[PDB]
Structure formats: C-alpha cells, structure tokens
Design a protein around this ligand. Structure first.
Ligand SMILES: OC[C@H]1O[C@@H](O[C@H]2[C@H](O)[C@@H](O)[C@H](O[C@H]3[C@H](O)[C@@H](O)[C@H](O[C@H]4[C@H](O)[C@@H](O)[C@H](O[C@H]5[C@H](O)[C@@H](O)[C@H](O[C@H]6[C@H](O)[C@@H](O)[C@H](O[C@H]7[C@H](O)[C@@H](O)[C@H](O[C@H]8[C@H](O)[C@@H](O)[C@H](O)O[C@@H]8CO)O[C@@H]7CO)O[C@@H]6CO)O[C@@H]5CO)O[C@@H]4CO)O[C@@H]3CO)O[C@@H]2CO)[C@H](O)[C@@H](O)[C@@H]1O
Ligand SMILES: [Ca+2]
Ligand SMILES: [Cl-]
Ligand SMILES: [Zn+2]
Length: 510
C-alpha cells in the first residue's frame, strides 16, 4: 500500500497563473489558450504572396505548404498574409486570447513557389526577396510582389489594420523574431549559409523590435526562440561567443543583457518575452522520451513520467548529456528565470515549443498534465505545445486544465501552496479563482506505474469543503470522465486512493 500525504494552504504562496501556458502550435483536439504561427516553415515566409521554403526539412522547396497546411481558401492564396489572417480568424473564432506570429529575420523569404532552390540559387538570387524591417516609406495594403523587398513593419501594419492593435480585443498580441537562429545555417542554408553570430542576432532583434513597436507600441516581442540547450549556452558555438561571451555564464545572460542595454538606449522595452524551445533530452529504456519513441518501451514511459522534474526539481538528474554535463544549469526553469532576474527583470518567459513524447499513451498525458502544472506554478507566461491531433493523451493533459468537464470547466487562475510527500510517485497542483478560495481546484497525478496510490489530503483553507467532484483520464481512455465524488471530508481532510497511471482534476466546494 503506497500512501502519500498532500498538504495545501489556500492562503499561502498565492500567485497568478498566466492563461497563456496552455497553448499549441498545431490544431489540436483540445481547448488551447494561445496559438503560435512559427517553426521551420515560418522563417522564409513571404506575407505579400504566402510562399515559403521547407528548407532542409524537404529539399528546400519554395511552395504553398503553408496555404495547404493552414486550410486557406484557394481564393485567398494570393491575398497578402492570408495564411496568417486565416490563422488568426480560426484562432479568434475559438475565442483563443493569444496569437503569436513569427516575423522573418533570417534575411530572405521565398520569391516564388516554383519548388526546389538550387544551391546556386542561395540568397540573394531571383528565388528570394530581401527582407527589410522598416520600409522608410508609406505602407500599402497591396504590397508590391514585384520589388526585391518585403517589409516586416509593413507586414504588421497590414495586420494591426485588419484586427486593430495589441490592445484591441481582436488584435494580435505577440510577434516572434524568427525561429531558432542557431539552426538557420542547418535548416535554411539556402537563406543563411553562415552560422549566425551573437552580434548579428542581437543586432537584428533590436532592429526588428523597433520596427515593430512603431506600428504597434502594445505588441509583445518574443525572442530568440532557441531550439535547445546548445543555443541557450553558446548560441550553438557561435563564431563570436568567444569574444562576446566573455564574462557570461551562457548566451541567455548575454541576450538578456544586450537586449536590456539596447532597451535602455532606445528608451523603451524591446524584449517582452524570453522565448526558448524545450525538447527533453531525457532518455530511458534506450531511447529519448520524445521524437518517435515507442510506447511499448516501459522503461522510456517511466523516464517520461519523471522527466518533467528537470524543469523545477533541483534534486532530479535525468539521463541525458544535459543531466550528465550541465547540472550547473538545472533545473532549467529556475535558471532561466534566475537569469531574467539578473540581466533584465520584468521580462516574461515562454516555452514556445515543447513535446514530452508518448502523445498517444497514458504517460504522455500525465507528463503533459505535470508540465502544465509546473508552468503555472513557476510563472511561465506562455507555452505552445508542438505536435498534432494524433496525440490524444497529450490533448488529454491540456483539457484537464482548460476544459475538464467538456463544458468549459477549467483550472483556477491563482496558484496556491501544495506539497506532496512523494514527488517521485505523484504530482499535485492546486489553485483558486482570483482571490476567492470558495472552490479549490486540484490536479493530482499518480505516477505509480502498476499499483494504486492512496492520498491523504489535509487542506488549510478559510472555507470548509464538504464536496469534491472528480474528473480524470487514465490507461482506460484519453477521455476525461467524471468519477464518484469525495463526500467524507472531515475538517478539510480526506483520503482518496487513485488507480495506477491516473490523472484527475478535483474540485472542492463548501
Ligand atoms: O514532412 C512534413 C512537412 O514538414 C514540413 O516542415 C516541418 C517539419 O517537418 C517539422 O519537423 C517542423 O517542426 C520543427 C520546428 O519547426 C523546429 O522548431 C524544431 O525542429 C528542430 C528541433 O527542435 C531540433 O532539436 C532538431 O535537431 C536538434 C536535435 O533535436 C538535438 O537533439 C541536437 O542536440 C545535440 C547537441 O547539439 C549536441 O551538442 C549534443 O551532444 C553534445 C552536447 O551538446 C555537449 O554539450 C556535451 O558536452 C560535454 C561532453 O559530452 C563531455 O565529453 C565533456 O567532458 O563535457 C562536455 C560539457 O562540458 O557533449 C555532447 C555529446 O556527448 O547532442 C545533441 C543530440 O543528442 O541538435 C539538433 C540540431 O543540430 O532540428 C529540428 C529542425 O531540423 O521542432 C520541430 C521538429 O521537432 O515544422 C516544419 C514546418 O514548419 C515541410 O516544410 C513540408 O514540406 C513537409 O511536407
Ligand atoms: Ca515587396
Ligand atoms: Cl536556436
Ligand atoms: Zn487528437
């Protein structure tokens, strides 16, 4: 019999949970609170004609994938930024509060959709148009597809026009400075063959932020969208990190420091959100927990259930080069947040890309649930998952927070102290709505693989809870079903045993 005590103090550690941590990049069979238009294809995207390059993902084709994959109407395929408007209309039509858009920064964008771009056609060539941030002239809601340029600030304008600015309801709140620059020369060699440098990146960002913050002072700028650890530390061995990184624990500090400095010189904040991508290197059972990992492998599934700990748990060492050789930077969330504090306070933090694998397995769903619990508890501002609708259990973890009863029910927005006696076998997050603890929401995850877990809840609230309804999903179905309610609460205390590998959302009320 595995017994664990859960302790909650509805009046301690009260912190708001950003509503934007529950987002996605792809369209999911779930309720998400933010949609991001980013990733490899977005780097060479041309708003004037909607053409883009698959880069190395696929023979360097310039084509209409984004119009196809986006579900755009062939009528609009020629309409400027149709791809992005279609993207935002769909978003708005689902009452999704936040739309992040990626702006082109690598330097060039598809001039056509004629297909393959020969190495000989490496930019600049007739296959591309040169991207420029500021137009230095009057914008036109009818861009000139014939010139040799594409203006980013004019791009925002076309948008801020159609939807109003970032302060308006229907407006687009965020803009990202491209996608994974440290990998530009790997993913888009036909656009930026040389390895981006620390100076170049900082320089282009500042340029782009200003260009944009003059078309919409209220818009939020995300950056740099680093693909993974290597870019966090040295911008993937940037050619000038040796000189630039002088006296910097890692590139993250450097970026935050220079963006800050630049912001002081400009007289206004240029960096709104530090944006990084996080794909667990956490290994188990021979393979990595994500990127095509086999759910038959019980050892990897078990490694996945513990992987989330790397985000906050200072006592957890995952099996990976990062756990093995990067302990000075783990847990990663505290370190990233810790860095924001030293070189640019007030700066938000977003994990615009992440996937813990097992998307169609119970553990994929518990990990996702646990990850979402961590983002809210540590102040993450926005998070958009990467993966499609086949990930039924991942979609399950998200709904546990955004729509657990199928009718719009959701986790509270104010996190409260909530401790577990055994973090290895379980996880628990608790919240209330605003400053009112009349209803205490609790996410309770039983990581015990094949044996049940009994939980002893002792809550310290101003209210007396007499009932506790339950919703949950498990190895039985990725569908969240209501369960028998808790009714024997004595002085805000009860015992609830939960089946193996189960994720539930409890809701207590007086
Ligand atoms: O096909 C359908 C349509 O597709 C369309 O295009 C799609 C794509 O299909 C879709 O995938 C894409 O979605 C993308 C998204 O757009 C991207 O944002 C991103 O994709 C990225 C990944 O994020 C990225 O990870 C991946 O490659 C990574 C890889 O994942 C990493 O694992 C790897 O990391 C390396 C690391 O660099 C290396 O250094 C490390 O080993 C070192 C370690 O770094 C070092 O520190 C350590 O040092 C120790 C040392 O070991 C020790 O001895 C000594 O004593 O101490 C020192 C420390 O002091 O040593 C170790 C070695 O021991 O190893 C790791 C790997 O294990 O890096 C690579 C990159 O290089 O790349 C992709 C992009 O290519 O996410 C999504 C994909 O997941 O969306 C597209 C559309 O937008 C087409 O357009 C259509 O046409 C198609 O139809
Ligand atoms: Ca043009
Ligand atoms: Cl990067
Ligand atoms: Zn699905």
């Amino acid at each position: 019999a595995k017994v664990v005590d859960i302790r909650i103090d509805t009046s301690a550690e009260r912190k708001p949970i950003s509503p934007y941590i529950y987002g996605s990049n792809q369209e999911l069979d779930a309720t998400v609170t933010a949609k991001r238009f980013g990733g490899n294809r977005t780097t060479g995207y041309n708003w004037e004609n909607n053409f883009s390059n698959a880069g190395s993902d696929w023979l360097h084709y310039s084509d209409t994938y984004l119009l196809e994959d986006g579900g755009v109407p062939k009528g609009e395929w020629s309409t400027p930024a149709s791809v992005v408007t279609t993207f935002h209309d769909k978003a708005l039509s689902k009452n999704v509060p936040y739309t992040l858009i990626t702006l082109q920064a690598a330097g060039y964008v598809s001039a056509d959709g004629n297909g393959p771009v020969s190495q000989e056609e490496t930019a600049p060539s007739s296959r591309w148009k040169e991207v420029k941030f500021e137009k230095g002239a009057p914008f036109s809601l009818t861009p000139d597809t014939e010139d040799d340029y594409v203006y980013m600030d004019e791009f925002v304008n076309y948008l801020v026009n159609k939807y109003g600015n970032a302060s308006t309801p229907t407006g687009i709140k965020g803009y990202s400075i491209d996608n994974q620059p440290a990998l530009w020369s790997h993913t888009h060699p036909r656009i930026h063959p040389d390895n981006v440098t620390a100076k170049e990146l900082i320089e282009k960002s500042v340029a782009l932020s200003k260009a944009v913050k003059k078309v919409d002072p209220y818009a939020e700028i995300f950056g740099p969208a680093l693909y993974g650890f290597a870019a966090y530390e040295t911008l993937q061995s940037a050619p000038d990190w040796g000189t630039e990184g002088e006296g910097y624990r890692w590139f993250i500090d450097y970026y935050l420091d220079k963006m800050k400095k630049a912001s002081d010189e400009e007289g206004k904040r240029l960096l709104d959100v530090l944006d990084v991508h996080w794909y667990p290197e956490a290994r188990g059972g021979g393979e990595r927990i994500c990127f095509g990992a086999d759910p038959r492998n019980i050892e990897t599934n078990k490694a996945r259930l513990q992987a989330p700990r790397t985000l906050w748990d200072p006592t957890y060492i995952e099996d990976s080069w990062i756990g093995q050789w990067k302990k000075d930077f783990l847990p990663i969330l505290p370190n990233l947040l810790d860095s924001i504090e030293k070189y640019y306070p007030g700066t938000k933090l977003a994990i615009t890309e992440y996937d813990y694998g097992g998307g169609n397995h119970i553990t994929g769903g518990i990990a996702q649930a646990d990850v979402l619990g961590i983002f809210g508890k540590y102040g993450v501002y926005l998070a958009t998952f990467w993966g499609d609708a086949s990930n039924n259990y991942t979609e399950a973890g998200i709904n546990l927070y955004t729509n657990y009863d199928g009718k719009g029910g959701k986790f509270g927005d104010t996190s409260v102290k909530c401790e577990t006696s055994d973090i290895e076998v379980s996880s628990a997050y608790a919240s209330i709505v605003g400053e009112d603890d009349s209803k205490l929401h609790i996410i309770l995850l039983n990581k015990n693989y094949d044996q049940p877990t009994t939980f002893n809840f002792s809550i310290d609230s101003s209210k007396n809870y007499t009932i506790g309804n339950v919703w949950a999903f498990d190895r039985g179905s990725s569908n969240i079903t209501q369960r028998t309610p808790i009714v024997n609460i004595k002085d805000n205390t009860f015992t609830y045993t939960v089946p193996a590998l189960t994720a539930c959302h409890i809701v207590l009320e007086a």
